[PDB]
């Protein structure tokens, strides 16, 4: 029977009287603050269903969540948006610890940016318990807070040996968390990694899941992770804990996107076969292929020795790093044993074969692995060279044209599931970011508050074009959308801030300045001014900041007039300065050092300053800080080239005494710069083997770069060469 319900109370009555075979039907509409406890007992061939009347037209908003409990249940056709769960998870396969759900299915459900507003209160979106449950054809996108998106729980035997099936799901874009805990899928936990889960994870599409280094974190036994697609995703499929796992038929399209892994092998009896990997640029534990060194003999929470890994019939095209025995050190002294790497195909366009060994690899028997002539080998036995021409098939995968060479690599029958073959047809897969300049151009004339008004009425992605004239700003400009402020004629538009802040970046705000000139002479004669800042509230979305062809002068009417000040727990997807000029500033340029509690949280992923001129700056050019020992993130990157810095950072209120102080930054590149009469660069290198290059610069009147290694000598590759000190 069909049981249409239009109020929660009516839902409560229908649940009390549903029978095996009935459908409880939630009427089309918006159900705000609806905590669904769907607790019932269907039969094997007569389930009890909870469905939205029209998939796409039932929305659960506000503090809404779902919990299944009982057996033989089905939930379908709901959308969770505009809100966030009041509990630890949006969808849970249990009432609580006392009543689990088994033999139940959740299908065609959408969770779209149902993100907790506090970026670091932790939750998950899907939490699976019990046994023989299915989570299929669902759509999850835009999780911006701490916490893995979907987890299989194993906390009781009831939930173990579960044979859960997780298939045909759209695991859509997850922005960078800027901390640890941004996994998309976790199966089990270190404390239960020795139990057998038997989870099948098949035919899912992972579309730019960029939350952290582990996309999938396997932490239990005998799971099968097969036939998935990982598209431009920053991270890896990591067999972190647990033995006896099968990783087959997966496809990785990194497209050369920065920091794409990766199958990471740890522990024992893992089977890695018939996987196709292409365009992966990740390195170290994010490499395209990684066989770890273990710790012997601990201790569930530590990585154990790789033992009886079988690694066969994989294809690796333009994979920049294949790492054997990676992580080797005093704790990770257990090199691989009893393994086999057979019939793989490695093709690499830039000379090398990407392989690097960090310990004895005699524990891996290599046999019948093909690589291309130009690809210089790193291992003698097990790898031969040949002339390959790779040609793309109708399935989208590359293969040797020689039919002899097709006993190497993946089978020609691999059909990677398509992005349009997962999720729900009735909910659109969209781009997560508004592109700059994607809207309309809007002419703005000078005056009083004309910049304020043009912003309030612009639509997201528009471009404000400033005619010639002066622009006085006596109201703080708040940015809650993607906006470019361009000058019609470069340098002909002059903005005069009149308040302690000129531009506050808010949730959904992203800013490009292009050709503007800022004279801060008329700012409030007070200390602490911040020309540009994020909202001082905790944010929920990352933000983008580009500054091109712009000039910013006279931030000096009182002390500590900062150019950019990031708020606590804020995160810039990138901050980029280009062909811009700065003169006379009494405070710091970029304050990205706010996360002082040393948990691995940082404020920016890519800071880039190129072709720009900074003169008379009392504070630092950048204070960037990522404290602690976490190795789950990839940033910050700091890249600064072709700039001229004069009289920078000598100020007395600059306690760093540096013109750049980078603590915990993981990629540094300072090339072809001028550091005239300034304070020195200071690095404080931490965990994770950070890579630093400072080559080709002038240090006239500025001391030499200073390297403080707080974790020596743990792999930190620093190359400070090619500079001339005067």
Ligand X SMILES: O=C(O)[C@H]1O[C@@H](O[C@H]2[C@H](O)[C@H](O)[C@H](O[C@H]3[C@H](O)[C@H](O)[C@H](O[C@H]4[C@H](O)[C@H](O)[C@H](O)O[C@@H]4C(=O)O)O[C@@H]3C(=O)O)O[C@@H]2C(=O)O)[C@@H](O)[C@@H](O)[C@@H]1O
Count H helices, E strands: the chain?
2, 72
Q: Is the Cβ of residue 134 or residue 241 nearer to Ca ion in the bound state?
A: 241
- Selected from 302, 429, 475, 508, the binder of a copy of itself by CB under 8 A is 475
**Per CB under 6 A, 219 contacts ligand X:** yes
The secondary structure of 584-646, three-state, reads EECCCCEEECCCCCCCCCCCECEEEEECCEEEEECCCCEEEECCCCCCCCCCCEEEEECCEEE
CB of 256 to a copy of itself, least distance (A): 33
**Per CB under 8 A, 498 contacts a copy of itself:** yes
What does the angle CA 4 – CA 10 – CA 14 come to, to the nearest 5 degrees?
65
Nearest to 328 by CA among 285, 365, 297, 272: 285
Q: What is the DSSP letter of 436?
A: T
**Per CB under 6 A, 190 contacts ligand X:** yes
CB of 631 to ligand X, least distance (A): 5
Footprint of a copy of itself on 75-104 (CB under 8 A): 86-88, 96-97
Q: Give the total residue count for the chain.
A: 726
Q: Is the Cβ of residue 389 or residue 596 nearer to a copy of itself in the bound state?
A: 596
- Selected from 305, 632, 678, 686, the binder of Ca ion by CB under 5 A is 632
Tokens of residue 712, six digits: 């020596």
CB-closest chain residue to ligand X: 302
**Per CB under 6 A, 25 contacts ligand X:** no
Sole window of 194-202, 294-302, 409-417, 585-593 interacting with ligand X (rule: CB under 6 A): 294-302
**Per CB under 5 A, 646 contacts Ca ion:** no
- Selected from 16, 597, 713, 724, the binder of a copy of itself by CB under 8 A is 597
Which x/- pattern, by CB under 6 A, does the window 295-314 give for ligand X?
Answer: x-----xxx-----------
- Selected from 49, 133, 159, 180, the binder of Ca ion by CB under 5 A is 180
In sequence order, which residues have a C-beta less than 8 Å from that of residue 704 and are 6 or more positions away?
Answer: 680, 725
CB 659 within 8 A of CB 694: no
302 binds, among a copy of itself, Ca ion, ligand X, none (CB under 5 to 8 A by kind): ligand X
Residue pointed to by tokens 């790193």? 378
CB of 324 to ligand X, least distance (A): 17
Q: Is the Cβ of residue 210 or residue 632 nearer to Ca ion in the bound state?
A: 632
Footprint of a copy of itself on 107-136 (CB under 8 A): 118, 120-122
- Selected from 241, 548, 623, 663, the binder of ligand X by CB under 6 A is 241
CB atoms under 10 Å from CB of 456, counted, come to: 12
CB atoms under 10 Å from CB of 450, counted, come to: 18
Distances (CA, A) of 273 to 167, 229, 270, 344, 411: 19, 15, 10, 9, 10
Footprint of ligand X on 628-687 (CB under 6 A): 631
Sole window of 101-109, 183-191, 239-247, 321-329 interacting with a copy of itself (rule: CB under 8 A): 183-191
- Selected from 490, 499, 508, 583, the binder of a copy of itself by CB under 8 A is 499
Ordered DSSP codes for 35-70? EEEEEEE-BTTB-EEEEESSTTSEEEEES-EEEEEE
Buried-state track 301-315, b at ≥16 Cβ within 10 A, e below 16: eebbbbbbbebbbbb
CB 72 within 8 A of CB 104: yes
Which three-class secondary structure state does DSSP give residue 419? Answer: helix
Nearest to 122 by CA among 629, 542, 601: 601
Sole window of 74-82, 268-276, 535-543, 715-723 interacting with a copy of itself (rule: CB under 8 A): 535-543
139 binds, among a copy of itself, Ca ion, ligand X, none (CB under 5 to 8 A by kind): none
**Per CB under 8 A, 560 contacts a copy of itself:** yes
CB of 219 to ligand X, least distance (A): 5
Q: Enumerate binding residues for a copy of itself (CB under 8 A).
A: 86-88, 96-97, 118, 120-122, 146-147, 180-181, 189-191, 448-449, 472, 474-476, 498-501, 524-528, 536-538, 560, 568, 596-599, 653
Q: Enumerate binding residues for ligand X (CB under 6 A).
A: 189-190, 217, 219, 240-241, 295, 301-303, 332, 631
Q: Enumerate binding residues for Ca ion (CB under 5 A).
A: 180, 214, 632
């Amino acid at each position: 029977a069909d049981l249409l319900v239009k109020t929660p109370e009516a839902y409560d009555q229908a649940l009390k009287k549903a029978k095996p075979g009935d459908d409880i039907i939630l009427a089309n509409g918006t159900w705000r603050d609806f905590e669904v406890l769907f607790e019932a007992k269907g039969n094997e061939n007569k389930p009890i269903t909870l469905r939205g009347q029209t998939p796409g037209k039932v929305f659960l908003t506000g503090q809404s969540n779902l919990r299944l409990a009982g057996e033989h249940l089905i939930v379908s056709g709901l959308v969770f948006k505009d809100g966030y769960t009041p509990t630890g998870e949006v969808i849970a396969f249990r009432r609580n610890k006392d009543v689990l759900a088994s033999h139940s299915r959740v299908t065609q459900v959408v969770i779209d940016n149902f993100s907790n507003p506090e970026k670091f209160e932790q939750d998950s979106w899907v939490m699976v318990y019990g046994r023989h449950n299915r989570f299929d054809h669902n759509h999850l996108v835009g999780k911006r807070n701490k916490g893995v998106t979907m987890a299989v729980r194993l906390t009781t035997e009831s939930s173990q040996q579960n044979h859960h099936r997780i298939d045909h799901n759209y695991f859509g874009p997850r922005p960078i968390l800027g901390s640890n805990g941004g996994e998309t899928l976790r199966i089990g936990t270190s404390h239960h990694s020795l139990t057998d889960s038997f989870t099948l994870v098949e035919n899912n599409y992972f579309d730019r899941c960029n939350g952290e280094v582990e996309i999938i974190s396997n932490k239990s036994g005998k799971n099968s992770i097969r036939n998935n697609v990982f598209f431009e995703s920053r991270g890896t499929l990591t067999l972190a804990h647990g033995n006896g796992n099968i990783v087959e038929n997966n496809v990785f399209f990194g497209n050369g996107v920065d920091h794409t892994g990766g199958i990471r092998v740890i522990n024992r009896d893992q089977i890695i076969r018939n996987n196709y990997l292409e365009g992966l640029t990740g390195y170290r534990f994010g490499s395209g292929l990684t066989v770890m060194n273990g710790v012997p003999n601990s201790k569930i929470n530590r990585y154990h020795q790789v033992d009886n890994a079988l690694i066969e019939n994989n294809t690796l095209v333009n994979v920049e790093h294949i790492q054997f025995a990676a992580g080797s050190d005093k704790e990770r002294s257990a090199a691989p044993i009893n393994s086999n790497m057979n019939n793989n195909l490695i093709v690499n366009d830039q000379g090398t074969d990407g392989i690097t060994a960090f310990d004895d690899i005699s524990g891996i028997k290599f046999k019948d692995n093909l690589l291309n002539q130009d690809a210089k080998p790193s291992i003698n036995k097990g790898f031969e060279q040949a002339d390959i021409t790779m040609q793309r098939h109708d399935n989208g995968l590359l293969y040797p044209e020689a039919k002899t060479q097709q006993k190497y690599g993946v089978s020609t029958q691999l059909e990677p599931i398509g992005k349009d073959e997962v999720g729900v047809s009735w909910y659109p897969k969209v781009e997560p970011d508004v592109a700059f300049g994607s809207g309309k151009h809007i002419a703005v004339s000078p005056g009083d508050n004309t910049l304020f008004d043009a912003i309030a009425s612009a639509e997201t992605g528009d471009v404000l074009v400033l005619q010639a004239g002066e622009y006085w700003v006596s109201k703080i400009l708040s940015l809650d959308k993607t906006l470019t402020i361009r000058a019609q004629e470069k340098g002909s538009a002059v903005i005069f801030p009149q308040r302690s802040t000129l531009i506050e970046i808010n949730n959904k705000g992203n800013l490009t300045l292009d050709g503007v000139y800022v004279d801060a002479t008329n700012a409030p004669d007070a200390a602490g001014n911040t020309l540009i800042r994020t909202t001082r509230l905790p944010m929920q979305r990352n933000y983008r900041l580009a500054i091109k062809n712009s000039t910013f002068e006279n931030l000096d009417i009182n002390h500590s007039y900062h150019f950019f000040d990031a708020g606590n727990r804020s995160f810039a997807d990138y901050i980029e300065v280009q062909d811009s000029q700065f003169k006379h500033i009494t405070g710091d340029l970029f304050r990205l050092n706010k996360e002082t509690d040393d948990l691995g949280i940082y404020n920016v992923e890519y800071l880039t300053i190129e072709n720009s001129n900074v003169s008379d700056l009392q504070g630092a050019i950048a204070k960037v800080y990522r404290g602690g020992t976490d190795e789950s993130t990839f940033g910050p990157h700091v890249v600064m080239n072709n700039n001229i810095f004069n009289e920078v950072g000598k100020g007395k209120r600059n306690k760093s005494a540096a013109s750049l102080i980078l603590h915990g930054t993981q990629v540094n590149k300072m090339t072809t710069n001028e550091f005239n009469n300034s304070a020195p660069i200071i690095f404080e290198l931490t965990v994770g083997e950070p890579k630093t290059w400072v080559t080709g610069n002038v240090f006239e009147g500025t001391p030499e770069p200073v390297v403080r290694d707080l974790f020596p000598l743990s792999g930190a590759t620093t190359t400070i060469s090619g500079n001339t000190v005067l």
